[model samples]
Target chain A: APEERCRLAAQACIRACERYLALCTESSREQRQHAGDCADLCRLAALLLERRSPWAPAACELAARYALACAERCDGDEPLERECAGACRRFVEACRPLL
Target chain B: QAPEERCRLAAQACIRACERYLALCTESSREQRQHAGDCADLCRLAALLLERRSPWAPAACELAARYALACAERCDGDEPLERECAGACRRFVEACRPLL
Candidate 1:
């Protein structure tokens, strides 16, 4: 189950990234900017993980920063943000030790 | 006119108020204290901006408002400790309103 965790973690981040982008897309200029940044990073991380690339760990560090930013940008009582932030947080820790 | 001086005074007041909130608050409602911590952080950042009279005070002010917003969410019952933090946060938010 240990190895399965990293694989599962990447899978989870992809969904959170997509949901975060959709909710914040039409929100505002600031919101859209953050959303795009977060989505792109997570997408890259997800792809790297899928291919089991060594780059996956490095990509996660970058994704973590944007995920935190996205959480702050949402900064409301939005449920999507909780999950989004949660996923990003998980992705960060799950990959941190890899690097 | 000591407009910058006035800003420093307001910033100090905000800091002290936040300090008082942190000191008086207990762990029973950790959420309030947590929000209080963020309040102090942003308020102090604003204070530094006021001290240097940075042109980017506008962003600092916005940051204060965001911290305040978070604090308010966890500030239920308007309990004395949270009320104090809310009040201080309000002062900080208002002080930076002009630049925002």
Candidate 2:
């Protein structure tokens, strides 16, 4: 049951990522501008994951890339930025198994 | 570890709480606002924990309170939130037991 739940949880995370990407893409220009290219990469990665195609490995790679990109974009002097970057790093690690 | 190090780590965790709180509060649905508020409360406790004053009892109590709130709020809805709140509450209790 635990394993099954874990699997479901992972799937949920994937879905959350998808939702976040959609929100990011559809957000105001100010939000997109604030997020920069990182938002775009995240959107692309979410799309890739949604497909869940045979190329899961490639999808994982894209997710990891997007995570890294988000981290880079959020890298700044502020605490919020640092924390956001850290969250992105954590997401990448969580998705590593899927990759 | 030194007391200062513990305090520093606690402070860092407080930062994490703030970040988590912001993320949850911003993105979560109205039903999840309680969870976000609980997170905010816990984050404030984290700041108090770093203060290292008045021993650890009061701090532990605050942590327990926050965790309890979080647990209550996340009882329904997403499994991740539920699990995280449960674990966080357990950790708060564990961390506070010695002081109690």
Candidate 3:
């Protein structure tokens, strides 16, 4: 159960990061940088949640912090970015308990 | 565990302290939650970055430390858990010292 649970949540968030990356090219450099770091952080967070990293809770926090940051940058964009922002927001909030 | 390992564990513990306060914080006012939960967030971020050896560690740790100071004072006299949480945040700050 934990395996599937972590995998789906992690997979979804990672996908959101990729989609965010693709959409943000037309956005400002600052937004791109923020979203890019979020992509990397979410990927790392996914690895941690799946026990691929040495630190799970720590990685979770990093993901939350960065995801919140990314969400702020993209919230004003279109629906996909808004969707990305919301997904990442949920991921980070979900991470709050793990932290 | 090494330095990072020790810090990693400490940070997790730090979150527990924060979350524990959170249970009490929910029924309380925002004024009360501000320092306790807020400081916990800082220390949490500090721990994660320190372990990951992030370049943002310097800024994040510094922000965590500064916030921890305010956190300690706001913890008030004889508030054991808040004191512990704030104190732990200071530790997270110190852990960042090596990398900084």
Best by TM-score: 3
Clashing pairs in 3: none
DockQ ranking, best first: 3, 1, 2
Native contacts kept (model 3): 0.00
Tell me the DockQ of each model, to 2 decimals: 0.03, 0.01, 0.06
lDDT of 1 by residue, B14-91 (tens): 567666776876642655555565556555655665665654444555655666656655663456766765666666
Q: Write the per-residue lDDT of candidate 2 for residues A1-99, one digit (tens) a residue.
A: 322332343344344433443444344433233243333333333433444423333434544565565566545555545544665565566556666
Write the residue-wise lDDT of candidate 3 on B1-100 in tens digits: 5766666566676667666765654353454455556556556655666666655555556655665566555554456665665666566556656655
Cα lDDT, model 2, residue B66:
44
> Which candidate has the highest lDDT of all?
3
A-chain TM-score of every model: 0.70, 0.47, 0.81
Worst 10 residues of 1 chain A by lDDT: A47-56
Q: Kindly report the fnat of each predicted structure, to 2 decimals.
A: 0.00, 0.00, 0.00
The per-residue C-alpha lDDT of model 3 at residue A97 equals 57
lDDT for each residue of candidate 1 in A11-67, tens digit (9 for 90 to 100): 676677577667644466665555555555555556545555444555566556665
Model 3: per-residue lDDT, tens digit, A1-99?
A: 443354456567667767767855567766665666566566655654554332456556766787787788777657668877888787776776567
